[PDB]
Amino acid sequence: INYEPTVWSRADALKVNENDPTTTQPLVSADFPVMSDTVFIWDTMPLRELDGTVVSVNGWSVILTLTADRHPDDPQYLDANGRYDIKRDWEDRHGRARMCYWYSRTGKDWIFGGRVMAEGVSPTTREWAGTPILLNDKGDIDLYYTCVTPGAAIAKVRGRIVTSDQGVELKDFTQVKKLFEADGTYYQTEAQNSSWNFRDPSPFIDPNDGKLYMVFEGNVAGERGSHTVGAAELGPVPPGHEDVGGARFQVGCIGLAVAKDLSGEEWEILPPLVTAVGVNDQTERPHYIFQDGKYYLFTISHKFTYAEGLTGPDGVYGFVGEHLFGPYRPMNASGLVLGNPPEQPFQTYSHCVMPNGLVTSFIDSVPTDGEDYRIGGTEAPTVRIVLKGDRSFVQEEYDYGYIPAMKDVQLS
Amino acid sequence: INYEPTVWSRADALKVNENDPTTTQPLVSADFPVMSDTVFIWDTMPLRELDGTVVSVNGWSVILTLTADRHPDDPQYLDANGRYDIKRDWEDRHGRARMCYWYSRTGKDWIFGGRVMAEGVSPTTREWAGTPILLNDKGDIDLYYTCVTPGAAIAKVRGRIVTSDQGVELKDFTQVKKLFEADGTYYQTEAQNSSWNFRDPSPFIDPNDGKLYMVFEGNVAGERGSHTVGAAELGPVPPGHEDVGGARFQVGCIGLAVAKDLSGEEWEILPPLVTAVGVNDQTERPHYIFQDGKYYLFTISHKFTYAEGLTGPDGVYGFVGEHLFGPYRPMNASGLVLGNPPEQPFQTYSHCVMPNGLVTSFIDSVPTDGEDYRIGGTEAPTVRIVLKGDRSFVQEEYDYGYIPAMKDVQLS
């Protein structure tokens, strides 16, 4: 394939509205419950099939989380006044990230299952995000995830789930295979940019051609600082908006790759599908919903990774089209699908939109009193969106961390 | 035809953003020039062909305006301090409205041509808006306009244009034929609502079937107060937005009619194309652009005719689709195409979007100093928009009242 990417332009991004009640995340209460007092969780990945369906197994719902320990009694986090520096502990989570699983009969009130992989199985100590796929009714699972530092590679590891009346166990995740890394012609490398982004596999079977593909976060290849913000990247901005400052340093994209067959053992990279040069450096955790004859491609991004001269909220953005290879259109004209409320701009992150319309996210920082705030590291209230053509609309909210099964699979 | 209308819902209208720089009219300077110190003008109607092309004749650009005299020395407008009450004179224009024409070799600096029709030719003293159509290269014109009070009827009157090196004359507009009025089953009548809207013919030849049609402003038929704001009219509003108050009293729609042949002597009304029940009472001066395989249907509306619980600016709104009979989608997700800036919310009105992308409007009220303001009754700066799929983007601004010809027609 040699398709041209869809450009999310600066003029599109000028339409972002942080004050639109149809695209704003409901406020999180400062009295939120926490799902564990021994671990933090953040990016959450429901067990699913390749067509997107979120599944239970023998009546058990299952989710994976990036996870790190809480250290409330560790001297390295106790300050000179003996106060626990929970902000520092929370910020240190990324370097200690490991994949854990949780299970529940109800889709909430999650029971901790522990590590997916034994320590030392992963080629990198950090285990960053991806997707767990239930392959069949024998309980075989492929976990697609990101190995980071040194380098960054999308990888997979095969294992299995077994259950009983007492709970769920994931086991036999012992051999990680790296699948691919940034190439330097389509996706930017560490050599081209020490802060390059390359991560977050989201595999699926295409509803039109029946092949196995994945989307992932990349950056547009090229030496940092060399990218052109030209007419296509600027788009039809209004008078006064022609100066882009240092916008060339923001080069996020959603990448695509195709498996050479349905085993997903070996992959070919394909050119970027959606590019945000001059607009935002991060289009993270891309994923699809396939509904009404359309491809809805969602991705999460941050207020602080926008280019100079633009502003937008942390939250989830989206692009829609009728063909896998595009062209796509920005959802709601600007691209924004669900943004945090400007009064609590960092309350939630890592929205995962599931085909039943429910969106899960985790709680990051919620203001309390004065300039004071509470750190979450726990699931936020799930909220439903509905999609109508190229637009979306937020609907009602559900319990903290509610991720119900769309289908139950009984093991053979 | 029995097609279902496209509904512009309350949830769509919740997306309106008065602060979007890609959809905001440039600010009008309080030092604007006035095109006449003897008449006010407002709604402006360029001479055009049925395919939308704005035309000059023998090198002369021609526009029609609704027009009323200025009365700066009339005792009825001089207050007890001898100050001229220009606000009252300006507000009294509607009851004195008459169709005048203007001409220019440059598309600006308009020369006054005087009345189109002699007094007493029109069945009603008020001559309200419509469209002047150049029928052929012999200089035959059909003027479609609105006869109001008593009642409201869409009407037409045939005449001709002749020119010389000295200027333009329109003449022989002597026999007005009323074409149709509100029926009571599709469009609301005076009996159903003393404030019913029915006006503003915009005729065109359909690019797909070659028939002559027109759009116009209507209201959805039914007794005032009886209309249902149900699930379709509310749309997928977010939590907290379910109460609609008195929204059932706002029932604007864009109507459509088809000529029984290309003479446009006799017409059949068709069901509403776009309805705004529970959203806005006024979808005025509807008109099309046909571009990129799509129908772009523009209409002007007011801040003050929105239903309870919604807010939006005076300006032009739009809907886009691939088929004359729909369904259509709201432009820019909310419907807003060009809104007045919230600092000058009443600076311009009656946007007419022409197929070269230029938009003409008139100046209404521009703030000066304190709670003080200046009344216009003259043309505003023309501004260009570009259309890209279901979105629009404001571009550069031009001189006051610049309405250049897209094509010149030499008379035979």
Author numbering:
A (entry chain A), B (entry chain A): 20 to 431
Quote the authors verbatim.
Among them, levansucrases (sucrose: 2,6-β-d-fructan fructosyltransferase, EC 2.4.1.10) catalyze both sucrose hydrolysis, with the release of glucose and fructose, and levan synthesis. Levansucrase from Bacillus subtilis, Bacillus megaterium, Gluconacetobacter diazotrophicus, Erwinia amylovora, and Erwinia tasmaniensis was extensively purified, and their structure was described. ,− All of them display a single domain with a conserved five-bladed β-propeller topology. ,, Comparison of different levansucrases shows that the architecture of the central substrate-binding pocket is also conserved. In particular, the enzymatic mechanism of sucrose hydrolysis and levan synthesis involves the action of a catalytic triad including two aspartates, acting as a nucleophile and stabilizer, and a glutamate as a general acid/base catalyst. To gain insight into the binding mechanism, the X-ray crystal structures of the beta levansucrase isoform from P. syringae pv actinidiae (Psa) in its native form and in complex with TPIS were solved, confirming TPIS as a competitive inhibitor of levansucrases.
Although X-ray structures of glycosidases in complex with multivalent iminosugars are scarce in the literature − probably due to ligand flexibility, we succeeded in obtaining the crystal structure of Lscβ complexed with TPIS. The binding mode of the pyrrolidine iminosugar in TPIS reflected that previously described for the fructose moiety in the structure of levansucrase mutants of B. subtilis and Brenneria sp. in complex with sucrose. , This confirms that the pyrrolidine iminosugar moiety in TPIS mimics well the fructose moiety in sucrose. In agreement with the competitive mechanism highlighted by kinetic studies, a first binding site was observed at the active site. The hydroxyl groups of one iminosugar unit of TPIS establish hydrogen bonds with the peptide nitrogen of Ala148 and the side chains of catalytic residues Asp219 and Glu303. The endocyclic nitrogen of the same iminosugar unit forms a hydrogen bond with a water molecule that in turn is bound to His113, and a salt bridge with Asp62, considering the nitrogen protonated. The alkyl chain attached to the above-mentioned iminosugar endocyclic nitrogen forms Van der Waals contacts with Trp147, and the ethereal oxygen makes hydrogen bonds with Arg145 and Thr168. The electron density was absent for the remaining part of the tetravalent inhibitor, suggesting a certain degree of disorder relative to the other three iminosugar-ending tails of TPIS, which are likely to occupy multiple conformations. A second molecule of TPIS binds an alternative secondary binding site located at the interface between two different dimers inside the crystal lattice, approximately 30 Å far from the active site.
